[PDB]
Amino acid sequence: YTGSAIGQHWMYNGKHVLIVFDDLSKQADAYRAISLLLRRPPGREAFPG
Amino acid sequence: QVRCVYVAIGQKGTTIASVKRALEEGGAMEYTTIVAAPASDAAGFKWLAPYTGSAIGQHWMYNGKHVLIVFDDLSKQADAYRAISLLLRRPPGREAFPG
Amino acid sequence: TAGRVVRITGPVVDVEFPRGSVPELFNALHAEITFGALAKTLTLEVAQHLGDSLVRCISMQPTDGLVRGVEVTDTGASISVPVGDGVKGHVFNALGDCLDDPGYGKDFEHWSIHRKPPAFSDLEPRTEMLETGLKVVDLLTPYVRGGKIALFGGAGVGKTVLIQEMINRIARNFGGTSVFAGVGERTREGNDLWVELADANVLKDTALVFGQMDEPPGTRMRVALSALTMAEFFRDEQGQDVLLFIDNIFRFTQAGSEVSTLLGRMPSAVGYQPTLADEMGELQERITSTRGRSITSMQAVYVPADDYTDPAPATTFAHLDATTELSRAVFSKGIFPAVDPLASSSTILDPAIVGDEHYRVAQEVIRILQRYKDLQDIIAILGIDELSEEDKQLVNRARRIERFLSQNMMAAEQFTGQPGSTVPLKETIEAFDKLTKGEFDHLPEQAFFLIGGLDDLAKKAESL
Amino acid sequence: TAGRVVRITGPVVDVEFPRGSVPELFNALHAEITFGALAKTLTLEVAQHLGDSLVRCISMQPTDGLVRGVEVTDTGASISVPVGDGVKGHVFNALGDCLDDPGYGKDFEHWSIHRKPPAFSDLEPRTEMLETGLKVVDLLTPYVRGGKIALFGGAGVGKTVLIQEMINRIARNFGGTSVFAGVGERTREGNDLWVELADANVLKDTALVFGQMDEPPGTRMRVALSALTMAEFFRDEQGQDVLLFIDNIFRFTQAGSEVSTLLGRMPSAVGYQPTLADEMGELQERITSTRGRSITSMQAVYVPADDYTDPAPATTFAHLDATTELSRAVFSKGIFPAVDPLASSSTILDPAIVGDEHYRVAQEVIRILQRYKDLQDIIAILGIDELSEEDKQLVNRARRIERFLSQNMMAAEQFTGQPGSTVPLKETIEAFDKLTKGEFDHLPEQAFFLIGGLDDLAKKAESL
Amino acid sequence: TMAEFFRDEQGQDVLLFIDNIFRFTQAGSEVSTLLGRMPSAVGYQPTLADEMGELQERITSTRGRSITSMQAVYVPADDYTDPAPATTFAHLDATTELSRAVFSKGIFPAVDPLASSSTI
Amino acid sequence: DGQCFLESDLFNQGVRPAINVGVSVSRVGGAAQIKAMKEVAGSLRLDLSQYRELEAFAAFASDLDAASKAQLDRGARLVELLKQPQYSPLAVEEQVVAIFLGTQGHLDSVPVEDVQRFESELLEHVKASHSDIFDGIRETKKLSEEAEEK
Amino acid sequence: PVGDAFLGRVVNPLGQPIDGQGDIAAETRRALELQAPSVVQRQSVSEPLQ
Amino acid sequence: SKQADAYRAISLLLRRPPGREAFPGDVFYLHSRLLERCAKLSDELGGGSMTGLPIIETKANDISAFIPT
Amino acid sequence: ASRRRAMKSATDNADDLIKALTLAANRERQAQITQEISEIVGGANAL
């Protein structure tokens, strides 16, 4: 999210920028872990909807 | 000198009778022991018998004799243990076996 | 001493009692229904205690029409059932009250349905061989007296037909006292069985009692116990060999599952009972032939969903000695006695018990069928052109021996319109050895379809 | 002041404290247990806070023989182990008690078991050519000094023997300090390796710490932390190259799985505990060679049912740079090293820092193995007679290549009477170039089994 | 609602276009798990049939005016046996397929007559 | 500390023990068995594994080489001799004698169907003639050149 | 309880004869839970079991 | 089958513990109690006879399914 | 001439085993995953 905001700031003023995301599976795993530990119901593949 | 101890868990009595007749034919009854836990009995005996056999063998070991032990079935004790654990309101695990 | 209904749901009932008196486990409780149209009295059995003089109990009648606060009375005893000499020749319900003749009874002895297995000192192994006119059962898995019989298969694989076939064979060959019972059987077949039994003029010595689908499960797991109690009563005092017949025990297990789901206990694998093995062993070990008491029983088992991964028949596998299995593919092939030879086995087959020729014949047949199945994968696409002749002859012999096992029992008289056949074991083994010599290679395969004997084999073959 | 015990169930214990008496996380607690035959001293590590002055924790000893109401004392400290120069040539447990002498190691300085991973600002890539005396590793995946090395494979492969041989060859030529830690293994292996090390002079120069599986899983998690603490202390202050050796990596992962399952977290896919990845990564950041210090660590990884789709092997692969795996098929055919060159990978193979002859030899051999694997089942079914002349020549060359890789080792002396062999690098590369040129296709099949050197191959050729 | 008003008021024959159907099913599953119900049928709405019927009961022509529509469904994981495709196929009359080689042949419709069928 | 595998495929194949030697392995090794056994027998599980491998890969071979045919013959004899029936006690001397006969190719001319019975015959004859050699084994637990020559 | 009189007879897991005749004289009785021997008390294995 | 689906949904609304394929075990009893009501009476009572024809739709022509089983 | 056609037909028939086995494998994997999620749900909600 911080990377997206930093890119958007430069983009909005007319500065051409390019954004690369290294890995998203780990982000999904971290979000799933924090959701489960927050005591929220699980879904398919123990994933929040 | 080699001493053997037989342990059967959750098996029909007739199987034990046939086995004992076979060993009677074989003439080994003089140096063998049999520990029985028929499936009719509660979960406690089935869940505890291997430990009794283990202690019995370990005694003659500390006596210094060579001891051989035979286990027939081990999944039966696992089933008894899972049953007791679930009845004790213990939280389950993978495939509901205890951890 | 009075009981008051506090909460009910499903067939299960919770009741509260005064501090002064609390009946022990497995005791009869009486209550009634005050409604007009559905007037009926009901009986509950003690299941478990919940503290504060709260007792959980199970019904065997439908629970519709109840109302809270109805007085509950106890008898201070377990469930008693009638036992006597004149029991045979009448149909019975779960309660044990006569169905054909209302009011018949209440003058014989009464015994509880909760007993204990016999002591181990009185146990004795048996090897008494039993023979049957069907060739396949005698050649592969010869039957042993005083043991247990298993008939495994899926749904609609001719279990019932072979059941009455064997019962007819036994009734014609052997007399004595016999008991038929089961759970999970339809009304139509029961009436047909009654009619045929009356036709045979052997219903006078046969005991009949069984349940149906449209009933609460309490009857479903209690009628079998009643039947076993009848069997033990006849075996012990009379001291005469009794034939026992039990069908579709699987429903029994399923019934238990249902009530466990109502209890609220933690579920098990595949949503089954928390404990099922102990009750299974208690049910099985109730059957045992004593030194002076020879008892033979047969069991019909249903496999759910055509899957053997289910522990429901897997648990029963550990309590059996002679087993015969059926498969869907064999039935789809065409032969009605769809009995798998590869899977089937028995513990009586041994050269010490039976001569070496029979052992050799069985081993050769087993190896031939094993090789045929092994080559089936390759032949499934390419065929015999790629394969060598040394295996082509094996393929031919396997096909002929497989088609030869087909037989025409008399139970199909109501379908095929032809009489049955029977063959002694010596002729069977001689014919099978002759076939394994390969002399019959010249004969067409179709002639082996549904043939009686080698004489009929030759007559049919030369008729075309 | 002290707290009390409220409930006991398994190894987890919850305790209670008065107001203003609850300690922080990762603290040591002591409890006294008394009995006629079972008296000990329970050590507990605080796990989490339950509120209401209740904290739940784990114990590292069996909880049998416990009684409620017993007060528990607190040291107000985490777990610590003594360190020093006298640690070498001694055996310690998870608590760090010297197994050799009961009174040993109770006077030296003690450090907190918990530490902090090094910062990123002191990180630097390391490049060095480290070569052993084995052909397969020298060609395919040469080792890296100061890097990360792990092995992959299931049970019954032989990685323990290879580890034994590798440490045996290395320690004789190393001047630094080597530390071995055993996470989970049988007592027999530990006893035998202790005997072997005592048979040599290296035992005084190395330090052994290990734990078994019969102990509660709480013990099986902390031994790795103690070993890492030892490695860090010896590396940081002495500034000397440190050798660290770990038995297995799956044991603590299991122990965490069951402890988290018991503690009260929901399970996850394949019944794996949550937050495994973070714990694994935090543990793995301890192992790092700094700018002025170089540390070499090996790892042995077990796989369940030989499945790389399991999340745990994929997770543990993300941290490794130099990879070597073992497969069951090559073991099945007969190779003792049982190393698959196809799937294995290195990170130091490139013409920029390595000779291009090695590069081209590796490319040719890997292409040969790739095509050979593709054509395997085609040769199996359709036969060698249906292949082309180039197909036949390449198939023969691949047969020679596959059989040529095998070589004997010293460690096999226990199993087989043939002593092992060692070979330098240039001779191996010349021999491999000669083989891949196809000038040795005339050699028989038997001449290509367990060949250490070219002279050995020639002498084997003359023997037939 | 827009289409029903237009049909009933202007009497004009109207056409309804829908992008996808599985997205609606996913939104329903999301609101189901959000409310905190008991997910069923491989994590699907136990009342998916009722909602689909409520949606699809308002398409059929009446009073001489026709309300036709076409919908495109995205099969998940190359499976026709998933319950959502099975249920959404229960109100289907015609299926149409467009290929790529047929367009490479140089034709406008780019429709294969061999992969399409109708119920009338 | 070791395991063995049994398959119903092996049992219905014809092998009475029906043990899977392809996967079976023992942790301790040959230090348990007598020195004479390890001298006479060794790496034989590898030989049988290779034999089964080549049977599987060459089941549809167009032509069989001389080495391939000889290895087929050797594997056939070895798999035939390894059979033993139930309730058949056997002592170490007879077992080592049988394996020594099997491994040296002394029975190559024997047809496969006659491999088993003939063995049962020879074990009888040595019982009445030159039985002292057995005594020597029980007195030495090893082999001598003169004993092997006799 | 533990003793040498247990040879050739059958007892329940509790340790009482169930099928045989008579009673067993056990010199001592031992607790089921114990401690396993350590590595220092172990030794290599070479004796064959025919 | 749709009736069974409705029964499953309404049972799940009741927070009743689920079974295989989330199907409660009462379904067998339900379909039975619906079914065996159809049978031919005895001659004396009138000898009436009703014949029942249920229809079941299966997916991917598999007899190995719970409801078909 | 007789050689060519048999192998052509062998190819065309060999396609079918691939197709059927892929169908069976898909059915098995989906059954396994749905059983897994059902079991984890039953374990989760029972507490």
Curated annotation (Swiss-Prot), chains C, D:
Domain of life of the organism encoding this protein: Bacteria
Chief location: membrane
Catalysed reactions listed for this entry: ATP + H2O + 4 H(+)(in) = ADP + phosphate + 5 H(+)(out)
Gene Ontology MF: a single term: ATP hydrolysis activity
Subcellular location: Cell membrane
Residues annotated as binding ATP: 153-160
Keyword Cell membrane: yes
Key words, A-Z: ATP synthesis, ATP-binding, Cell membrane, CF(1), Hydrogen ion transport, Ion transport, Membrane, Nucleotide-binding, Translocase, Transport
Record-level GO cellular component terms: plasma membrane; proton-transporting ATP synthase complex
Spans traversing the lipid bilayer: none
Membrane topology: Peripheral membrane protein
E.C. code: 7.1.2.2
Subunit description: F-type ATPases have 2 components, CF(1) - the catalytic core - and CF(0) - the membrane proton channel. CF(1) has five subunits: alpha(3), beta(3), gamma(1), delta(1), epsilon(1). CF(0) has three main subunits: a(1), b(2) and c(9-12). The alpha and beta chains form an alternating ring which encloses part of the gamma chain. CF(1) is attached to CF(0) by a central stalk formed by the gamma and epsilon chains, while a peripheral stalk is formed by the delta and b chains.
Its biological purpose: Produces ATP from ADP in the presence of a proton gradient across the membrane. The catalytic sites are hosted primarily by the beta subunits.
Family recorded in the similarity comment: Belongs to the ATPase alpha/beta chains family.
UniProt protein name: ATP synthase subunit beta
From Swiss-Prot, chain F:
Site feature Required for activity, where: 24
Keyword Cell division: no
Localisation: Cell membrane
Superkingdom of the source species: Bacteria
Cellular-component GO terms for this entry: plasma membrane; proton-transporting ATP synthase complex
Keyword Hydrolase carried by entry: no
Any one GO MF annotation of this record: proton-transporting ATP synthase activity, rotational mechanism
Family: Belongs to the ATPase alpha/beta chains family.
Subunit structure: F-type ATPases have 2 components, CF(1) - the catalytic core - and CF(0) - the membrane proton channel. CF(1) has five subunits: alpha(3), beta(3), gamma(1), delta(1), epsilon(1). CF(0) has three main subunits: a(1), b(2) and c(9-12). The alpha and beta chains form an alternating ring which encloses part of the gamma chain. CF(1) is attached to CF(0) by a central stalk formed by the gamma and epsilon chains, while a peripheral stalk is formed by the delta and b chains.
Protein name as catalogued: ATP synthase subunit alpha
Species of origin: Mycolicibacterium smegmatis (strain ATCC 700084 / mc(2)155)
From Swiss-Prot, chain I:
Protein name as annotated: ATP synthase gamma chain
UniProt similarity note: Belongs to the ATPase gamma chain family.
Record's subunit section: F-type ATPases have 2 components, CF(1) - the catalytic core - and CF(0) - the membrane proton channel. CF(1) has five subunits: alpha(3), beta(3), gamma(1), delta(1), epsilon(1). CF(0) has three main subunits: a, b and c.
Compartments, record wording: Cell membrane
Signal peptide: none
Full-protein residues shown: 257 to 303 of 307
Described function: Produces ATP from ADP in the presence of a proton gradient across the membrane. The gamma chain is believed to be important in regulating ATPase activity and the flow of protons through the CF(0) complex.
Origin: domain of life: Bacteria
